[PDB]
């Protein structure tokens, strides 16, 4: 019922409203989530100018219903459940040495967008301390409390699904071209030399099926040199039979380069691939356009994600931007290292790659899958991306229990915070969510969270603020008792 | 490496273990076979001198890596299948505290198609009265000892999300292959449905051809012409050859005919061979005709079991088996084969079409089964009729057991790798019994092999007997897989 609510990119906003050692400040937050991936955009603003204590302290208190729960695992979400009225979500932050969060927030809906806002009080804080004093790092580093093997697992399992996703990318595409060019070949057979047998009419049937079992194809021509062209195209819904005019050299299979086509007011990204009609080996020829446009979703998806379709010398033929299609990414990024992807592709092997991106001033992690389309002429490649930086980050994780005198749940977790020129500030954390509303939530097992953030800058914001990246995944061992907890 | 090439498919393994433990001399044989694709193995040893001196728990380690599972992100740190087929040296040494120590010396190597594994070994100090020797440990691990709760809680959420991906990514290949034969097969109708215009019964059998042609799934196909001019055309694809039978009350079933339908699934005979498939019906503002085709269902075998052999099948109406690794189960139904009446959750996630998860007990052996249902519809109802359902599965005990490392480090003076390890078995009436283990593996041949980062190897094993086996005996069932830090240190530390 409230995953219901999370199943696309849902709208963000969080408002703070703090006090620390009499230090009153104001904290405004706007971003996006989506939990079937367990991904958070967000950035932060002090309203108020300088913000009195470093904004890694604020990152567990400015959303969990935002963590992807593996489907074995849903009846133990409690955030989403108690949507849309909302959950209380009060914590204690002992900082060691130092003084202490108290933080009541709300999350819940109000219309399409999810709200988080918060009641921030702090006391018992050092002037000179780590935290007033802003002596914590912006992100972690060392090797304080990550477990390598654990870290070993996930960082295989990210690389590995990457790789995967651009393999299944892959076959779709190969699976529609399949069809066309089966299909292609059927029109070739018929068309090639059926006189009387195959009348015009007949032929234009045939073409027309062609066009209605593979809707990326835009239009298909039979060009015979009685010199003269049957000729169908697909206008929306329609299939009509426009009367084009105008081979012989052509022995063999080709397609052109891409370009653009002017079809109506639109111009449509494609590529004309010829098809000899011979006979006696040349009666005429098959031509059809490719559209590319029409592999859009099939590339990229419902929702913006982050995959391409490239094609020779890594030329960009599908991409979330449409900016840069028809672009090379080698023209398109300076970093050098993208010429890993095009070295993939003209070997023909699979592989990863890191990359800066011009998009976000962030390292990229690129998985490049090249395929062929028809059996480095006939051949394209996947590229599926994230960002690095985020995904190969520690994570930090929260032992979510069930607390039934409150029909909700609890949690204690440590946060350890880089302290400048060396040491550790630890942030002792204590949480108790409860739903708001006496409607039915699903109370559940033991299991974990696990988050991964980056915290970053805006170049162009002036004011004082935190960019924050994160992914946020549910885990458990809940169907399996067999290793004896 | 050209190495990992031998270890594409079903591996052949033997092992032969020569053992000496404070003079009580011992013989183990072992037989079996690894799937380095999947870090799969199967394994049963015998002791063939009487009664094994030790307890086989303390023998799984010496009595294999070239069968890890590797990442292909990670496949230039794999040392151990770099070194096929001439082989690696593993020599170990084994400490139990307040106890003895084995010494063991292995060659790993390929004698023709089979990796086998001599062993020797040599054991001292041990005590006659303790966990050893006085045969005191147990069969199986168990209690919390040294299992991160958190690292398997990933682990066995990433093996459930796995199987159910599988599951769907078979689903979506089938679904592909029966897209384009309905989609054929609409074309056909429409052509065939004007048996009044210039389509002479030639160019209907050209039609009929290229639609077996494009779709080999497809046996045969006939076009039934019953409101004029009664009269059936039929192609059939023959040994790769398309050829044209002739044919001559179902004709009063074809005036029935008012919507899609397909036959119950049986088996054809076609020359001396049964071909399990079904009939799929399409009538041609009344009935001018029906176009027939039989859909080899048996052509998917491979689409939904793979070139290997796999826990894969395919399942229709009531939960019969469509397609199984195993043929002799064939047209039966799940429930009709397998007493565990939990299997008839499949069946009723396949019914209210919806994806799961299932536990069950497996004809197979006495193993408990994990099975990932993920059903689909291979036409589009608001009734069954046209939905299938892939079935992925697999050793539940195996795979949400807990997992043991082993941390593989580079040995560059001796061009090899190197390892230490503790395993912990469990005390009958008591605690744990600590096994500490130091490895180094050296490369038999003098060629190249790669020298890898350091990185991980988690190993689940389970430990079984075989009811008709009398002698001493274990039967190991194990999943190997390596893990890594490998290309993403920086951004992490």
Redesign the interface.
């Known amino acids: 019922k409230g995953e219901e609510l999370f199943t696309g990119v849902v709208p963000i906003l969080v408002e703070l409203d703090g006090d620390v050692n009499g230090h009153k400040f104001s904290v405004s937050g706007e971003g996006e989530g989506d939990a079937t991936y367990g991904k958070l955009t967000l950035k932060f603003i002090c309203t108020t100018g300088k913000l009195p204590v470093p904004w890694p302290t604020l990152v567990t208190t400015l959303v969990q219903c935002f963590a992807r729960y593996?489907?074995?695992?849903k009846q133990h979400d409690f955030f989403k459940s108690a949507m849309p009225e909302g959950y209380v979500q009060e914590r204690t932050i002992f900082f060691k040495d130092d003084g202490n969060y108290k933080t009541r927030a709300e999350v819940k809906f109000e219309g399409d967008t999810l709200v988080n806002r918060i009641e921030l009080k702090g006391i018992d804080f050092k002037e000179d301390g780590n935290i007033l004093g802003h002596k914590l790092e912006y992100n972690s580093?060392?090797?304080t409390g990550?477990?390598?093997?654990?870290?070993?697992?996930?960082?295989?399992?990210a690389?590995?699904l990457l790789?995967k996703k651009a393999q299944?990318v892959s076959f779709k595409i190969q699976?529609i071209m399949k069809?066309i060019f089966?299909?292609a070949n059927?029109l070739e057979?018929?068309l090639s030399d059926?006189n009387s047998?195959?009348?015009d009419t007949?032929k234009r049937?045939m073409l027309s099926?062609f066009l209605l079992?593979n809707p990326h194809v835009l239009l298909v021509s039979a060009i015979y040199t009685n010199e003269r062209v049957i000729t169908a195209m697909s206008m929306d819904s329609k299939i009509a039979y426009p009367n084009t005019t105008l081979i012989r050299s052509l022995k063999s299979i080709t397609h052109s380069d891409p370009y653009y086509k002017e079809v109506n007011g639109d111009k449509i990204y494609g590529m004309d691939i010829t098809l000899p009609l011979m006979g006696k080996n040349a009666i005429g020829a098959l031509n059809f356009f490719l559209n590319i446009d029409a592999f859009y979703t099939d590339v990229v998806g419902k929702k913006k994600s982050n995959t391409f379709l490239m094609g020779k010398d890594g030329r960009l033929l599908i991409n979330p931007n449409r900016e840069i299609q028809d672009k090379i990414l080698s023209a398109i990024n300076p970093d050098r290292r993208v010429a890993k992807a095009v070295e993939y592709y003209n070997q023909n092997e699979?592989?990863?790659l890191?990359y800066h991106s011009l998009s976000g001033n962030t390292?990229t992690?690129l998985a490049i899958q090249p395929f062929d389309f028809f059996e480095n002429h006939w051949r394209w490649a996947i590229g599926k991306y994230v960002n690095?930086?985020l995904?190969?980050?520690?994570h930090s994780?929260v032992y979510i229990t069930a607390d039934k005198q409150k029909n909700g749940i609890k949690a204690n977790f440590k946060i350890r915070h880089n302290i400048e020129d060396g040491g550790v500030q630890l942030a002792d954390h204590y949480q108790q969510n409860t739903p708001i509303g006496d409607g039915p939530v699903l109370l559940p097992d033991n299991?974990?969270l696990?988050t991964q953030s980056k915290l970053s800058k805006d170049p162009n914001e002036k004011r004082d603020h935190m960019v924050l990246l994160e992914f946020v995944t549910?885990?458990?061992?809940?169907?399996?008792?067999?290793?004896?907890?």
Not at 70 to 73: A, K, L, Q, R, V
Not at 146 to 157: G, N
């Open positions: 593996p489907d074995h695992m580093s060392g090797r990550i477990d390598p093997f654990t870290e070993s697992v996930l960082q295989s399992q690389t590995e790789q299944l699976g069809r089966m299909g059927t057979k018929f059926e047998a195959i009348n007949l049937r099926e079992a699979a592989g990863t890191s390292e992690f690095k930086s995904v190969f980050s520690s994780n299991h974990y696990s549910a885990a458990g061992i809940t169907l399996g008792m067999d290793e004896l907890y």
